[PDB]
Design a protein around this ligand. Structure first.
Ligand SMILES: O=c1ccn([C@@H]2O[C@H](COP(=O)(O)OP(=O)(O)O)[C@@H](O)[C@H]2O)c(=O)[nH]1
Ligand SMILES: O=c1ccn([C@@H]2O[C@H](COP(=O)(O)OP(=O)(O)O)[C@@H](O)[C@H]2O)c(=O)[nH]1
Ligand SMILES: [Mn+2]
Ligand SMILES: [Mn+2]
Lengths: 257, 254
């Protein structure tokens, strides 16, 4: 469709790398929808140009910052996601974290209604805000900005405010619970390997959730091996990390260096 | 119903029995009107059964079912809970659970109601579930187990395979997480616990370290802490476990 889009967010050049791989993976798997990246003034002029070659729209927006929460102190800036409700040139969109990677076609997500999301691991009565189907609207956008300013986020980021706003999600319509194939984190592979061993081959989206991102690794292509002098508690599944670095190396890196 | 609905647990040895005793005491503390039943296997000592009989309304001796954490092969023994057709509806609770408020309203639920598992929320966690004893379901589950086995070697995989519709059908079969709150979930997303946690109704000490594995100091009300420990970020539940044990269960062990 023409009025539908995949939307991601980059507030700097490091996450722009994630968004570029994400956009490239949506192309690899033949999305029929438009690709949109929301970018802030900290993204370099040259990176915005690169983004415009993968994404149909690059929308400049201002940073929204929860601030210096006690609740990863970098993640105050995630409140910048709420701008996704301002994109009213589209009837329906799928927001995807710039740290996600598409493994198969997921256009069937546009069958779903707002707010459709997958349960968060760790607290599964909240949804994970890395992949969600939503409906652009000026009223919702404004309602969300109001909640963010007046009450804030219980986790200091977008996921708190979004769960607080869409707080019937856990107990209403199971059709808004995305199956886990649409937002699979490495934390869940680690938590319950037997599940991954038996269903994992069905995964359509990988979410590289947690402090250490695929672009914070060193990757040797000659060995197809990855390392980093910063431990990851979520045992980032290497098959997936290697997949990310392949798409990056072949489709994205030549754009940058 | 007072005679016709029950909370059911399982103990295949005297260590997990202490867990069952704490569970049972906790359900009485919070004045359940339902029966309290524990399934026990022969590794449970004769004198421990006699103790379990002081708290539970009935101890019921079952055969160990092993699939063949390797100590969780015996968790297929849980399947025996569907044999309890003296009850029309039961709540099964692991012996590693602990009740913090009255949970009788779980009997409003229909088979199979369970909470999302915190690792892999598309599967339900098999530590707290509402079910209906049935000779038919029981036998179908035995057959599935012998035939296919379990994808995790334990009860949770087989149960999820059997009740496969749980994730995608009827949100009423998803219990709220406060009916099976795992301490690893306090720790992994602490922000959520600080705002939602005060209404926890059941805590499940899931994972390899169980409360009775701790060294507890009864004078100071402290436990010797492990070298990394999610229990010690919100230790109130673990000291509650040991309070109930030291206060209510220990004098029954003499
Ligand atoms: O410095 C940042 C951090 C956040 N993000 C955006 O906000 C999303 C959510 O942050 P992140 O994925 O790192 O949090 P997590 O998934 O690990 O909880 C990212 O994927 C980006 O799209 C960003 O643009 N710049
Ligand atoms: O050696 C054992 C192991 C398991 N269990 C029973 O099976 C349940 C499931 O095991 P556990 O709670 O250890 O698994 P987890 O919830 O940690 O995955 C226990 O709570 C007990 O009711 C038991 O009686 N003896
Ligand atoms: Mn993310
Ligand atoms: Mn347990």
């Amino acid at each position: 469709m023409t009025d539908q889009a995949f939307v991601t967010l980059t507030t700097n050049d490091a996450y722009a790398k994630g968004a570029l791989v994400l956009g490239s993976s949506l192309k690899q798997h033949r999305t029929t929808r438009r690709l949109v990246v929301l970018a802030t003034p900290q993204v370099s002029d040259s990176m915005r140009k690169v983004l415009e070659t993968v994404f149909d729209e690059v929308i400049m927006v201002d940073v929204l910052d929860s601030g210096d929460s006690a609740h990863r102190p970098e993640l105050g800036v995630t409140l910048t996601k709420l701008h996704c409700w301002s994109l009213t040139q589209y009837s329906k969109c799928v927001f995807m974290d710039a740290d996600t990677l598409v493994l198969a076609n997921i256009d069937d997500l546009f069958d779903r209604e707002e707010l459709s999301a997958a349960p968060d691991p760790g607290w599964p009565d909240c949804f994970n805000s890395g992949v969600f189907v939503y409906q652009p609207s000026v009223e919702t956008y404004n309602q969300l900005l109001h909640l963010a300013s007046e009450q804030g986020s219980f986790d200091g980021g977008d996921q708190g405010i979004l769960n607080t706003f869409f707080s019937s999600w856990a107990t209403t319509d199971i059709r808004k619970h995305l199956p886990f194939i649409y937002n699979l984190s490495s934390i869940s592979i680690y938590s319950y390997l037997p599940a991954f061993k038996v269903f994992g081959a069905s995964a359509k989206v990988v979410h590289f959730l947690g402090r250490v991102k695929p672009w914070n690794y060193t990757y040797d292509p000659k060995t197809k091996s990855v390392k980093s002098e910063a431990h990851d508690p979520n045992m980032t599944h290497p098959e997936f990390l290697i997949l990310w670095w392949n798409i990056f190396t072949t489709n994205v890196l030549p754009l940058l260096q």
